[PDB]
Design a protein around this ligand. Sequence first.
Ligand code: HEM
Ligand SMILES: Nc1cccc(-c2cc(-c3c(-c4ccc(O)cc4)n[nH]c3N)ccc2O)c1
Ligand SMILES: Nc1cccc(-c2cc(-c3c(-c4ccc(O)cc4)n[nH]c3N)ccc2O)c1
Length: 390
Amino acid sequence: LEVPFSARGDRIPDAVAELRTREPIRKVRTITGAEAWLVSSYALCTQVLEDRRFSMKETAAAGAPRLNALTVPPEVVNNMGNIADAGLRKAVMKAITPKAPGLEQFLRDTANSLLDNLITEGAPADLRNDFADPLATALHCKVLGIPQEDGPKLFRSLSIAFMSSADPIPAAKINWDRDIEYMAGILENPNITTGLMGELSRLRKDPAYSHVSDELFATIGVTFFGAGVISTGSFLTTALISLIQRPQLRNLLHEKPELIPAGVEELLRINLSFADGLPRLATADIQVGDVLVRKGELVLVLLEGANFDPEHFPNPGSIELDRPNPTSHLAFGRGQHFCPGSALGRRHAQIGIEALLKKMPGVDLAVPIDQLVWRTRFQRRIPERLPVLW
Ligand code: HEM
Ligand SMILES: Nc1cccc(-c2cc(-c3c(-c4ccc(O)cc4)n[nH]c3N)ccc2O)c1
Ligand SMILES: Nc1cccc(-c2cc(-c3c(-c4ccc(O)cc4)n[nH]c3N)ccc2O)c1
């Protein structure tokens, strides 16, 4: 049994439910040919993510079994850990909340501006390349304090940076080195005084951060831009497809926009944007279900396994806005490495959806759904284009 099962992100394979039933932890083979334990039940997914003995940091260890080839320097795997040790965690998290003044208004204006141009241009429109991704890019430029016109350049690295490859990718290092050099220049730029890079540039000259390397400062910039843009852009794209497939829900959210956060939360739960399970390495012998995971073995946490688990989410395929456990999904992960951009991710989706439902209430696919081209061997499930009419 080889993972991943399908690059299609518009429907979950029937095999996932069967697997969760029969073998909630199963030996699979990754694209690199390595063994791994695939966990697909909510209970066991939660257990793994809340046990730090299943380590993220150690997934980059030498000779360790691999989900896929590294496309970043080995130390980037422990990036949030290095941020914490350098005493920068509070500052970073503050810089990436949607609660920043003028941020939500910027998202709203940007989303409306993008949609107005699509309408002016006329159907069909590509909701990924000309809405979801540009909105994600524009947002993270604003969050970092870097020029808007620098966005598309940094975005270009992402079709390679987030590949899920069996072998090392020569272009990944080339792009990484280039983007690092860009962020280093930003730190030296006196004009950059706002956002994440503005604050980092400030802390860089502060005595209490004298021994925090310039490497880490630039790395934070590159990492948060790439991870944030790819995650919010891809999720919003696949969420829009979920809405298109659900006219009844669309109208309801259109009619009662206060329900949109609860809707986005359900869209998060059923979202299939993650193409691979979350990788962890066992730093000890740990019992997981019917399996004793040995030290040094690779464990993959299948997010849709847990999120479509009927034992935790009854009628998992249905979007229900009144669930008693609405945010208990694992779309933002769980435990030590819970997504620091979760609130920003929610707000990006909510504002993008609200604007679209206002501007395009009759939005629908301009092509048969099977005509969507799903990107292969990639860390996200996305259609190359999302053609719509309205
Ligand atoms: C819909 C949007 C997003 C989704 C679904 C998402 C999903 C996730 C998930 C599942 C994890 C856990 C990874 C693991 O445990 O191995 C994670 C971690 C992380 N996310 Fe997000 N994310 C989103 C947006 C963002 C944004 C906007 C940012 C930054 C601006 C961001 C930055 C990070 C970072 C730095 C980590 C690593 C945390 C750690 O290692 O402790 N993400 N994200
Ligand atoms: N595969 C890949 C993808 C993306 C980035 C990088 C990358 C890694 C390093 C690095 C090395 C390193 C540098 C060159 C080399 O021949 C072997 C190891 N040792 N320690 C660190 N941090 C430095 C800059 C880079 O751009 C590599
Ligand atoms: N939102 C979210 C959810 C889950 C993982 C992450 C995440 C992913 C990477 C990463 C990259 C990567 C990231 C940024 C970049 O400019 C180039 C390459 N390539 N391959 C991987 N794994 C690095 C740090 C991260 O925090 C982010």
